[PDB]
Structures are given as structure tokens and as C-alpha cells.
Amino acid sequence: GNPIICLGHHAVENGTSVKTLTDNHVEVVSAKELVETKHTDELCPSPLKLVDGQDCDLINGALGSPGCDRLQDTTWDVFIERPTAVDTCYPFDVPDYQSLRSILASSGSLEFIAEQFTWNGVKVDGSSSACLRGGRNSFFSRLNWLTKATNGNYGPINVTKENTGSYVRLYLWGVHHPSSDNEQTDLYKVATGRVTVSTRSDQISIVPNIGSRPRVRNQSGRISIYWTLVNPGDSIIFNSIGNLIAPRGHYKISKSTKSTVLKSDKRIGSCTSPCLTDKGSIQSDKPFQNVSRIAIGNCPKYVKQGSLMLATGMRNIPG
Amino acid sequence: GNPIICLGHHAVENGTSVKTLTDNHVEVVSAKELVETKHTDELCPSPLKLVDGQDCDLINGALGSPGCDRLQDTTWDVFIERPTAVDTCYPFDVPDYQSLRSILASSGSLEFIAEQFTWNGVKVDGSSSACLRGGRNSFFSRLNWLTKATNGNYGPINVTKENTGSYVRLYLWGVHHPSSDNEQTDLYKVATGRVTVSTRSDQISIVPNIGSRPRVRNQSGRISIYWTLVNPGDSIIFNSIGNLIAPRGHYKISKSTKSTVLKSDKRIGSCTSPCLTDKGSIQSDKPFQNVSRIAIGNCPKYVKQGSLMLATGMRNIPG
Amino acid sequence: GNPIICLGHHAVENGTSVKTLTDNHVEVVSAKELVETKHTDELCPSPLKLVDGQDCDLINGALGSPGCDRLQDTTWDVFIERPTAVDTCYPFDVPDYQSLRSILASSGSLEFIAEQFTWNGVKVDGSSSACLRGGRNSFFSRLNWLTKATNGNYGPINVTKENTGSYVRLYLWGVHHPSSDNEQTDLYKVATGRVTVSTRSDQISIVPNIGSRPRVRNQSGRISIYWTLVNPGDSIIFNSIGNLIAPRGHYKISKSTKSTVLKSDKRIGSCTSPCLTDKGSIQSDKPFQNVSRIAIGNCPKYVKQGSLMLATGMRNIPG
Amino acid sequence: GLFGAIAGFIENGWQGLIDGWYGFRHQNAEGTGTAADLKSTQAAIDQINGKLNRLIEKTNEKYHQIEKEFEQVEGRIQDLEKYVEDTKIDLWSYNAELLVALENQHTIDVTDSEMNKLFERVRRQLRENAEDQGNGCFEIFHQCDNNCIESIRNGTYDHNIYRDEAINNRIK
Amino acid sequence: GLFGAIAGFIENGWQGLIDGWYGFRHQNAEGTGTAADLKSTQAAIDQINGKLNRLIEKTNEKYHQIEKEFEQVEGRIQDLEKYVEDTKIDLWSYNAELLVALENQHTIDVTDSEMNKLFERVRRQLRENAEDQGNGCFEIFHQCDNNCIESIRNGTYDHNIYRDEAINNRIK
Amino acid sequence: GLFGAIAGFIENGWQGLIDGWYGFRHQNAEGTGTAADLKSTQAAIDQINGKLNRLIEKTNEKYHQIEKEFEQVEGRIQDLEKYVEDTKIDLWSYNAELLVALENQHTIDVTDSEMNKLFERVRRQLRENAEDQGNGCFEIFHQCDNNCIESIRNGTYDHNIYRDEAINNRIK
Numbered sequence A, B, C: 001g002n003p004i005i006c007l008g009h010h011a012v013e014n015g016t017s018v019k020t021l022t023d024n025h026v027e028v029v030s031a032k033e034l035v036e037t038k039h040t041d042e043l044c045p046s047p048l049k050l051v052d053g054q055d056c057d058l059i060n061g062a063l064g065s066p067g068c069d070r071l072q073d074t075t076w077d078v079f080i081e082r083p084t085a086v087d088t089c090y091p092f093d094v095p096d097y098q099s100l101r102s103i104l105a106s107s108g109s110l111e112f113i114a115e116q117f118t119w120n121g122v123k124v125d126g127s128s129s130a131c132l133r134g135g136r137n138s139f140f141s142r143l144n145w146l147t148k149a150t151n152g153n154y155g156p157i158n159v160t161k162e163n164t165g166s167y168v169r170l171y172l173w174g175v176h177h178p179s180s181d182n183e184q185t186d187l188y189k190v191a192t193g194r195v196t197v198s199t200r201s202d203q204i205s206i207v208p209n210i211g212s213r214p215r216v217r218n219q220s221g222r223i224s225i226y227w228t229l230v231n232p233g234d235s236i237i238f239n240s241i242g243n244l245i246a247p248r249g250h251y252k253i254s255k256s257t258k259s260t261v262l263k264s265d266k267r268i269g270s271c272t273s274p275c276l277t278d279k280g281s282i283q284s285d286k287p288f289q290n291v292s293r294i295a296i297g298n299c300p301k302y303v304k305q306g307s308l309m310l311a312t313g314m315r316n317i318p319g
Numbered sequence D, E, F: 001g002l003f004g005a006i007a008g009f010i011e012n013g014w015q016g017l018i019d020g021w022y023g024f025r026h027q028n029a030e031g032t033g034t035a036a037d038l039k040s041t042q043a044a045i046d047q048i049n050g051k052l053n054r055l056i057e058k059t060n061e062k063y064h065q066i067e068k069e070f071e072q073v074e075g076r077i078q079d080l081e082k083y084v085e086d087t088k089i090d091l092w093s094y095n096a097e098l099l100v101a102l103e104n105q106h107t108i109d110v111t112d113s114e115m116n117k118l119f120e121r122v123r124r125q126l127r128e129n130a131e132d133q134g135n136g137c138f139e140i141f142h143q144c145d146n147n148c149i150e151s152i153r154n155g156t157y158d159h160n161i162y163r164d165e166a167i168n169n170r171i172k
């Protein structure tokens, strides 16, 4: 018998299966899971600045609807809209609603820059029983419902604001579509109204349309919400013969800013995570995740697979 | 001479060229083609449920135009539109036509839920010589052409339907733009019409516009087709002072359903394939294909290359 | 001592670092950079046909605004719009402006097919002090400003052109929105105008809206620019009761043609490059580039990395 | 190939090996013969089959998508729909090109590897009884009848039986 | 594996090697023992760690994106937004699948390689003093006490000291 | 590297080998010298050149695309156009990163492989006339003048001429 010396390697009792280019099931000593499958079940309020809309969606928030007052001057990285949000004010619709939501979400702020306006020849601060605040008739806090003056006419409206500042302004305004001709004349004298809002470079003109619409909060008429941007240097004119829902000022557009809105259900926790999904927060170093394709922040990329094991050891050959 | 023993491998007379990271042309013993280049030249009617529009496109089908009656109650995975399809009825246009086609294609059904309506103060079932059925004046089978009553006025229309059901309804309706003022008054008394269709949450109002348009099937006027969705619980109102092309009921929206439309030329065969292209069906296990980027069903992914040979054997070295 | 023979390999004093799957920094004998980081700082006029808008953007060019006359009959692979471009004519806006720019850019031509029209019952060739050419009142060279006739009325306009040719025509036309009722009647007699432009298959109708808009080049009114395509065989009708800004002919659509517009700052050089960016031209065989995601022609693909070294030699082990 | 056995120190392949990928060709006192090696052939076939089944796991099933051809210019939306599709097709064309290239690189190295493992296996069975000739052949330094050849091929050859004979021949 | 050392001419691994990935097990006049090889273990661990840190360089940070779920049918734009997202998810799912497969292919070959480099290292230290047994073991043809075994393990073994003894035993 | 020849049992490279990638350095009764090996150098250069030409097949040519910068907020469509482009750029950045990494992994293994094939080639030419020294060198156990050295380098060396001399020196 001569001495022998053998070279070998380690082997554990229980290996882990990985895939390779040629094999579905190959047992190795150790492996790491690359697909994150777990989330927190609460939204973490840090490091991202969250604002919870609770019962207002972002637009009701921007218009100043009754449930929304706590959202004034709010600023966010991510605004959270709740599936429990409800309309509380005069029924309205927004042509290209989605784009207004997108533009608001993106600017990241509900801090209103209030403005003095002189609306000549009309009653101001119109209120409605479809918009109750503390049990009393009220309206969108950011809008001004004008009607005809005590003595008669809707003195033609023609008011202008110059953008003196260094930021792009966003102006929110509306048109009232009444349910009858009685109501049209009762409110605006003129049989047929007109609202024209314009800058040096863009313009919108709306003739309101009468008729009965299903009753909401007892109301058959509607307000259509429009918006106009105004660059530094430009001006905006509000020209109306009737039916103008007037602005009380404007919002500041900070463009291309890391801000957004997340439609989620989960409560805001006290955890810390740089990654929010509609399903909860992800706390993970894994390159991939399957929790949700709605992922905001520093997140693993969404993939379909529920598992991808990376081998981190040699073939496991016990026995 | 001592005995020898040699190790070797196989070699065939005619190899197949593959590519590798370092070589364009490398000859191996065997190889498999990964890009499918052939199709059937007929569309296979299984396992996917096909419906052939023949001479109606999907929208003429939905409106009930004369060539379209055989498409009633039809349901599909894939609706086939033919390049031979023709308009047979009063000339019309559809604002955002594509989206209506998309919405129809997707719901996968032409089964109309007919509804009793009471249109008060108007003549009903208007017909046209631009829409002939069996040689006789007719109209879109799903629409109701209202005009002024024998004795006079177009008694104001205001009709409402509540969505009592559990599915989203799609209502197809129109506005008639007349060629002259003679014709306007002749049909609707009123000098200027108005059609307003609305739910609790959305609304459209159209003032019809008069004027001469090129003659189609002898007709210079047009109908504009609009559509309104109505959720479970909501209501729709049809309010018109004139020019309403009224619905006869609604379609059911099954949303997010594996249904679509394919613009194709090929006849429907009797073959079996889970993959349809505009060029024919693909019957293949190959991961890739170049037949067409229009591919519906369980299909190889479209790629630009006409060939990708995967090596399935060692280097071929004969001689 | 027996003779020895050693096998070895080369080694240079200064290696180059590459990355591999397991290492950030691995020194090899030689390496090639795969990300192009440099550009020329002038746009090369070959092999791609460039046209410099200088002080006209593409649309002012298409409308025939005063600074634009040198762009007549111009044709391009790439039209260059300059950030110094300015409006020189009556203030206008274009609903879906971007799509008109896209359609023009793509057709690759500003060669106008002029047409004789008979506008009956109106004054023609209206001019404006907001559109000066050589110090004198003028208008878009491709448009025809009609007003009411010396003796009175705006004899109803109804003119038709049949597409006799084999190419799709693009017609550019407008609607004048006046600043007051004085001006409306002064120009078009009628209190409220109407412009309806239509083919067998599509149609647009606009009622102009009055009101004060911020003054541009002293002018408070606006022209809205619209466009209508006309297939071989189809016809177009221009029907107007007032406020029509009439075409003088049409542009030819060559569709699906390698043509585009580049918003750039750089001067046109005399170099040669098949790849233009907004930042300058790329002259390179590198597969990748980081210069800009705006890349037109035969270009390296844009990537985020500033460097990717491909090893082209073995490990470098000196000493 | 990474191992230099196929298209390397094995000059060429055998067109007559019709029942295996790898084999033994011998010469002894009784003559000559070729037989297939099953283990090495099976190891290569398994790996190639493995990578082929892998390329089938079929997960491409799409219904309503977007339009991909157009009857008329539109501008903005159409540009996007085409750019989207063209971006998609380029990326998949790239995936398929790379997948095949790197798969082929690997397969060729695997097949070359398995050739080499066979060579190495036999090298180890023969110990000091044989010398590597440089061409995939071993010179065996003792008489090796058909049974002995087969014992090499089936891995029962015991080098100790022939050791004194072989070592003696090796040395003069 | 490309080298046929792990799951190859090394029949199996040692469950008792708890302080290394690779090691030496010997038998001599004093008994038997197992020790870990540090260089070969470290070379494998470094490469695996290298490829793991590489998989972290974290560059996925997105805020305002597009909507990905929808409350109501819309047609054209919605089709595009969904097609865009579905195209994106398919391509990333593909990247991750391929990345893992090819990474695992490679790691297994690396680990097999490092086993082989250890074998080869010792083969070279022993020169004509040992013969390869076919199973990852060398028969050493001279007495080799614990110090001698350790000199093999730490790379100070000088084959010339034992050469005449070994060569003589090799030959009868 | 997978083979452990470059940055492995070859301690380092030769800065003076200026006319090849791989070579022979010898020592004999007449002195010392270095020469380049053409086959092994050519095999490596060909493979590297192959993979470089492969990376040029140029298929990126785009004209009208989509807008990629914007003068004013718009909301929905703009979000999509940016998301589309950002998705595209991420996927290509990923492709390029992986392509280079895996290409470099491979090239380094190829170059290491070719070093090893050269070593193995010479090992086979020398048969029992030389012993592996552990450092990429063979000790040759007979006189080998310049012509003999060159016969090794050009693959005409016939081991049978020197066999009795060499085998005798090997054994005392």
C-alpha cells in the first residue's frame, strides 16, 4: 500500500434546483431567488412624500370640492387616490380628464396661487345645493359661479391676466350647461352663452348646450371643466357672453418633476421603502419582482415568472 | 506492433451551416430551423371562432346596413373584415371610428339587445333611397330615423333608459347633418337641431351642420355616428330638439375578452391552427416566424430574419 | 541540465480594463470601445437631403408666411426646424398641430400644386397688417382671404374639386374667428359664419367664435387651420356661409417615405455622415452611441452607458 | 471548440459511425473494429435535447393588440403605433440572433467537451499500460485480444493484470 | 459540466467538508485526514460573488409612467397603452429567464473548472512520483508522512527528494 | 479563465513577444531563444476578428420616428411617448451591457483555451521524451540542438529518434 491523496469538493444533504440552458432541474449546493414575491401590505411614507386623497380624487382636490379642503397647499412625490373617493359637488365632466389628472399628478402640488379678478356686470360667488359644505349651499372653492346682476344683464366679460412670473401657470375654469331655457335666461339673460379662453398661441371656445341630463345631487345641468396653460410672458383672456365658471387663480406647473398618482387601497404605514406598488411596498435587493406592474420608485423590474433561482454554488452530489 | 485504440466521433457527407458568436458559417452535423416561414394560405376555423364579414365591415355590421343581416347575433374570437366590404346605406362618418371598431371587435358579439322606446311627437322608422334592402327604401336596422309628426312639430325628445342589468351597455346613435335649410325644416321643423346624449358621468352634445357634401348613393347629407357606454346603475338620456338618429337598443360589453378583428384576404379553410395572420394560418413549433407582424393566437414571435439555424450536433469534419 | 522548452503568451506594459459576467475590472491586452461618444457639431448635408427652415418652421412654410418664400418647391429627407423660427403673419392656431407637422415632415415636399378656384360672390385676396411682406399688407401665400363683395352679400360658397390624379391630395384651409360683431358683419355680412369641408368619407364643420384674444402683431382675432385629405377618385367641397380662409391648391402626399423633421441648433456643414442628431452628426462604426436619443439615418443605437469596452485580446499579465 | 478535440487533435470524424456520436476504433492481433460509446453519445444527446425542449416552453399568446397597417396618413398617433411595433420587432430580432449564436457557440463546445471526456476516461483506465499517440489514439503496450478491447470499452479493464507486461514494453 | 470533474471523474462530494469548497483527503502511514484548499475555494467564491454584485448595479427608478389598469373601454389609445406595457413585460421576462439560465450554465462550468484546476495543480507538483487513479486520487509511490502530505497541500513539496524512491516503486 | 493556463500555470506573459500572441522560449546546448507560434496566434485572432465583424452587421436605420422632447405639458399622449422611448432605451442599454460582459467572459476563455491547446500540442509531440515542469515548460531529456528545437516548433519532431536516450535519462 502506497499513500494516496484525493481531491474533492463539498456536498450538502439538501440541494436547490436551478435551470440552465440545457436542463430544467439541476441541483446545486446553494442558490438565490431573483424574483421578489413579497410586499409590505401598507404603503411606506418614506423616503417618498405621500399625500392621501382619502375621499377626494386629485381633480376634486384641484377644483376645491367639499370633502377636499385638507388637500390645500399639499405637495407630494406620490398622490394616493382611493377607490372610496366620491363626488360631493355640482356634477361635472372633464374633456380629456386623464390628461388633466396626469398634468396635476406630475406637478406634484395643490398649492393654489389665488388671484384678484374683477368680473364686471355679474353676480359672483354662486352657490349650489348639489355642493354642500357644512350643510350649506357652496361650490368648488377654486371656482367662481357668475350669474346676471341684480338689475339685469350679464355685462360682457373680458378680463385678462398677464403671466408676469417665471413659471407656467395652469388655469382651471368651466362652462355651465343648463337643463332648460328658463334656467339659461334666469341665470345669464342671454338665450345662448359663450365662453372663450385664449392666449397668444392657443384658444378654446365653447357654446353651452341645454337639455336634461340624469339628476345628480338633484341637479340635471352640468359644468364642463377646461384648462389653459400660460407661459412666462404670455397672457390669458376670459371672454364670456354667459355661462362662464370663472377661475379664482391658478396652479404652478413644475414640469418634468418626479411626481405621480397611485390608485391604491392599502393604508399608509410607518415603514420605510423606496418602492410603492398598488398592492403595498417592496423592500428587496432582488433584481426582479412579480408583485405588480404598477411600481413607483426604485423597484425591481416587473416580470411574469414567480421564481428565478440563480445558482451560487457547484453541483450538489451527495452519495 | 502494439494494439491501438482510437477515440473518435461521427461525420456525415453533407453538413449544415450555423452561426456562432465568432463565425458566420460553421458546419455542423445537424441543425433545426427556428424561424417559421410558411403559412397555410387559408384561415383555419379552429380552434378559434371566426366570423366572416364578407361584404360588411364590423361597423356596418353593428349599425345593421343592408348587406349585413347575416351578422346578427354573431359571436367571435376573431372577426374577419374583407377588403371587398362596401357601404350600402346612407352615407355616414364616425368620429374616432377606430375606437368604435376596437370596442366592437373586442366585445366579440353582434347580438343586439333590442329595446322598446317611446319617441313622442315624431314620425318614426324613416327610410332612404340611399339604403336599399330588397330594392326598397330602408335604413340601418339598429337605428331609428325620426322626423316631424304628420300635423307639425318635432315634439321635444327626452327619453331615458336605466341600466337595470349587470353588464355595461353600448348605445349606438347618430345625428343627421342635412344638405339644405329646406331639408332641415322639412324634416325637423326647427331651423337648427340639437342632440344631447348623457349619463351621470359623461355627456355629448352636437349641433348639426348644414351644407352640400359630395353625393353618395345620391345623397349629399350625412349621419354622424356616436356611442355612449352606460354602467350598471347609471342612466342615459336622449334629449333632442331635432336631427336625432335614435337607437333601437344596445350591445353588451364583455370587456377584456380575447376577441379581435383581422383584416384579411384569405378564404376560410377547414384546417386547424391556433395562429392566424393576415396572410394565412401558421402551423408550427418554431419559436420565431417572419410570415407577418399581424399574428393572432398562439404564434411564434415575429422576427425580421428569414432563417436562424440552431445547431443540434457537433462540428462536421468528413475527410 | 537538460534542455527546456516553455510555452507562453504576450504581455504589454499598459492593459485595458473590461467587464465580464463576474468582474468589473479585468485587464486585457487590447479592447475596443463600443459606445460612440463624439459627434461633428455641424449637420452633414450628405448623403441625406437637408432643407434648412431658418426662420420658418415647417407649418409657416406650408402656409406661405412671409419669411418662408425660399422654402417653395423644396424637398427633403430631413427638414430642419430652428429654435429661432418666428411667426410673421396673422396669428393662427392648428388643432392637432403636431399631426399636421408630422404629415408634412413625412411627405418630404413643399411643392404646392396650385389650383384655379372660382369663389363666387366674395372679394378675394384679403390682406393684413399683421402679415407684412416687403413692408406691405399681405397674407399666407397658400391661402385666400375672402370677404363680402363690394355691393353686399357673401354669396354662398360651394366649390368642389375632384381628385382626377393618382396621388392623395392634402388641402390646407382655415376659419376666421373675429374679435367683434362689428368685424364679423363688416367682413362677412352674416352675423354667424360657417365653414364645412368634406369628402365622400370624411367631413369637418366649424362655426366661428367671436371675442377678444390677446393682440398679436396688433391683431385680436385668429385663424384656425384645418386640413383635408382627398384620395384618387374622391371629391372635396368647400361650403361656406362666411369666414372661410380658402385654399389656393394642395400638396402631394407621398406616404411612407423616408422623410422627417429635426429640431436642431447646429449649422449645416460640408461633412459627410449617414446619421444626424439634434446635437450634430455621428461618423462611426460603433454599435452604440450616447450622443442623443434623437438619431436619424443609419446610426448606432442610443444607450445610457458612456462606455462599453469589448475585450479584443487575452488577460494582460506583465511581471 | 474550447477543447481542441473535435476539429482538433482528432483529425476528423468517422462517416461510418452510424449508431453513435462517439466511439472506439481498435487494432489488435485479431483485426480491427469500430463500436459506439453509449455514455458519451447519451450525455451529448441529452444536453442538446434539454436545450431544445427549453426553447419550446411556449408563452406567446396574443389576441386584441394594435393595428399594424394603415390606409391613410394621420400623423401623431399613427407614428407612435408604428414606432411601438418597430421597436418591438427590432428587440425580438436581436434576441433571436443572440440566442442562436450563443446557443451554437455552447453546443459546439459541449460536443467538443464530451469527446474530450471520453478520451480522458480511457486515458484513466489504461494507466501506465498505454501512451497517448497525439491523434486520439492510445498505443497499448501489451497483447489485447477482443475480450480485452471490450473490457476497455465497457469499463471493466483492470490495468494491474497487464501492468508488468506493459511497463516492460514501454521501457525497451 | 464542461470539465467532467464535478459530477464526473470525482464520483461525489464530501458532506464533511464543512470549511471549504474543495479539499484534500489523504491516507498515509500515520492515518487519514481531510483539509480544505483555500486558493481553489477562494477562486470559485470570488467569481460567484463577482457575478452577484454585478446583478445589483441598480438602475431601475421610475416615477410618472403610464396608467396600467382601466375602469372603462376606450378603444384606440387604451389598446396602445396595454400593448406597450405587455410588450415591455414580455421582453423583461425573457431577459430574466435567459440571464439566469446562462448564468447558471456558466457558474456550474466555473465550479467544475476550479475543481479541475486543483487536480491539475497537484498533478504537476507530484511529477513522476505519483500516478492518477482515475477518481480524483493520486497514488503516491513513496512514504509520505504528515509533513510530506502538508507540503503537497501548501505547495512546497519538492518532487526531487522522493524521485528515486518513487520511480523505483513505479517500476516494480 | 476556464483553463487556468493564462493567469494560471503560466505565471506571466512575455512583453518581448512582439510578433505573436503565443510562443516558445527554449534553452539548449547552443543557448536560448524565443519564437512565435503562428497556428495558435492565428486561431485566437480569427475568433476575435470573427466576433468583431459579427458586431457590425449593421441593421439600425430609422427616419420618421416619434418626437422625443417636448415644449409644454400635455398629459396622456406625451406620457406614453416618453414611456415608450424610456422603455426602449432601458432595454437596449441592458442588451449592450450583457452583450459585452458575456462576450468578454468568452474571449478571455477562448484566449486561455488557445494557450492550453498549444501546451497540449507540444505535450503530445514529446511523448515520453519530456516531463511537464508545472509552469508551461517541458524538460526535454535528451540533447536538442537548434534544429531539434525548431522541429518541435514546426511539428516535425519525431519522438522515436530520441526515445531511448530520453527514457534512459528519465530513469537515472
Ligand SMILES: CC(C)(C)c1cc(O)ccc1O
Binding pocket: B021, D093, D094, D095, D097, D098, D101, F054, F055, F056, F057, F058, F099
Ligand atoms: C449575435 C450578435 C450579438 C453578434 C448579433 C449580430 C447581429 O447582426 C444582430 C443581432 C445580434 O444579436
Ligand SMILES: CC(C)(C)c1cc(O)ccc1O
Binding pocket: A021, D054, D055, D056, D057, D058, D099, E093, E094, E095, E097, E098, E101
Ligand atoms: C432561456 C431560454 C432562452 C431557453 C428561455 C426559455 C423560455 O421559456 C423563456 C425565455 C427564455 O429566454
Ligand SMILES: CC(C)(C)c1cc(O)ccc1O
Binding pocket: C021, E054, E055, E056, E057, E058, E099, F093, F094, F095, F097, F098, F101
Ligand atoms: C451584465 C449584467 C447582466 C450583469 C448587467 C448588469 C447591469 O448593471 C446592467 C445590465 C446588465 O445586463
